[PDB]
Design an enzyme around this catalytic site. Sequence first.
Site, PDB file in Angstrom:
ATOM      1  N   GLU A  50       0.818  -1.155  -0.029  1.00 19.89           N
ATOM      2  CA  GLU A  50       0.101   0.207  -0.027  1.00 19.89           C
ATOM      3  C   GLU A  50       0.860   1.248   0.166  1.00 19.89           C
ATOM      4  OE1 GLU A  50      -2.707   1.347   3.632  1.00 19.89           O
ATOM      5  OE2 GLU A  50      -3.991   0.223   2.139  1.00 19.89           O
ATOM      6  N   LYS A  52       0.775   5.140   0.924  1.00 21.61           N
ATOM      7  CA  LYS A  52      -0.048   6.158   1.772  1.00 21.61           C
ATOM      8  C   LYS A  52       0.778   7.106   2.512  1.00 21.61           C
ATOM      9  CE  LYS A  52      -1.028   3.532   5.772  1.00 21.61           C
ATOM     10  NZ  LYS A  52      -2.083   2.317   5.903  1.00 21.61           N
ATOM     11  N   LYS A 109      -8.006   2.456  -2.582  1.00 26.99           N
ATOM     12  CA  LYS A 109      -8.388   2.568  -1.017  1.00 26.99           C
ATOM     13  C   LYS A 109      -8.924   3.865  -0.653  1.00 26.99           C
ATOM     14  CE  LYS A 109      -7.454  -0.042   2.572  1.00 26.99           C
ATOM     15  NZ  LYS A 109      -6.332   0.200   3.444  1.00 26.99           N
ATOM     16  N   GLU A 158     -14.582  -5.429   3.457  1.00 32.44           N
ATOM     17  CA  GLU A 158     -13.748  -5.480   4.769  1.00 32.44           C
ATOM     18  C   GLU A 158     -14.725  -5.715   5.924  1.00 32.44           C
ATOM     19  OE1 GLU A 158     -11.878  -1.753   6.944  1.00 32.44           O
ATOM     20  OE2 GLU A 158     -10.453  -2.612   5.545  1.00 32.44           O
ATOM     21  N   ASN A 179      -9.930  -6.867   9.018  1.00 34.02           N
ATOM     22  CA  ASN A 179      -9.171  -5.800   9.353  1.00 34.02           C
ATOM     23  C   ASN A 179      -8.992  -5.746  10.818  1.00 34.02           C
ATOM     24  OD1 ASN A 179      -7.671  -3.151   9.888  1.00 34.02           O
ATOM     25  ND2 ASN A 179      -9.156  -2.106   8.738  1.00 34.02           N
ATOM     26  N   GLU A 209      -5.503  -7.367   7.036  1.00 33.84           N
ATOM     27  CA  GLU A 209      -5.340  -6.065   6.921  1.00 33.84           C
ATOM     28  C   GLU A 209      -4.675  -5.262   8.113  1.00 33.84           C
ATOM     29  OE1 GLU A 209      -9.352  -5.524   5.097  1.00 33.84           O
ATOM     30  OE2 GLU A 209      -8.383  -3.555   4.553  1.00 33.84           O
ATOM     31  N   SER A 210      -3.857  -4.472   8.065  1.00 34.26           N
ATOM     32  CA  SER A 210      -3.151  -3.484   9.164  1.00 34.26           C
ATOM     33  C   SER A 210      -2.288  -4.311  10.388  1.00 34.26           C
ATOM     34  CB  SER A 210      -4.321  -3.051   9.858  1.00 34.26           C
ATOM     35  OG  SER A 210      -5.272  -2.352   9.054  1.00 34.26           O
TER      36      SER A 210
END
Length: 247
Positions: A50, A52, A109, A158, A179, A209-210
């Site tokens: 990703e 960001k 996203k 998600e 997530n 995710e995360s």
Amino acid sequence: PRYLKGWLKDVVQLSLRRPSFRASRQRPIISLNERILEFNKRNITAIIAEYKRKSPSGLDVERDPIEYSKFMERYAVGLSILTEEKYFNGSYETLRKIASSVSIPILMKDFIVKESQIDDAYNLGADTVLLIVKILTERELESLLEYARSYGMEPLIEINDENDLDIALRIGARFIGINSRDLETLEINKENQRKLISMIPSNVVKVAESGISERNEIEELRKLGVNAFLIGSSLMRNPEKIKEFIL
Ligand SMILES: O=C(O)c1ccccc1NCC(O)[C@H](O)[C@H](O)COP(=O)(O)O
């Protein structure tokens, strides 16, 4: 959208008023979930890198979006670009430059609450889109899911709790993201994430995710049946880690 409070309420408002983007699409759709399945059979760890620049939890790094992507392209199963403007410092222009530069799948996203955002993703060059169960009602989710498929995309749905999973399963989601971070409080809970991963039908492609920063974390999640991993912060801070995550 659903009743929301705090920053989730704000970003959702920014999205309702997000102007559409008019552009011609060059290349055909490259399926992100089908490619994750082919990395699975080739026994290659599937990482969705990703991009960001900022994040409400504190991230703040300057890094060229084109170079970072061309680099990640040598190893990642797909890219995930933030297009949300106020909290992540993303933009539609960044997604566009990225799509014209690489040829691997791109996930857009953002906080998608209306059909014009999916038109935006398609026209910009993204290959799939993210739909967050906690900010949408069941009908909205079902509608946005069908709209995206009308463009040949299988969106990433998600979830963060059991209630979200009941809903995703009912509407026929085939590509789910679990997530660990709660969008509302910004808290990470690895335990709650593991419980959920274990409740998912084996025929749906799962994406954790995360909060992933170490290779041992990826190894653990993999034996748990997870197909792919979405990693943002650790890779933004140190692009080089992609080499460690991949061995
Ligand atoms: O990414 C964030 O920092 C963040 C902060 C507040 C609310 C939502 C957020 N993002 C949620 C999300 O799905 C992330 O962009 C990715 O899953 C990657 O998280 P990361 O790898 O950076 O921990």
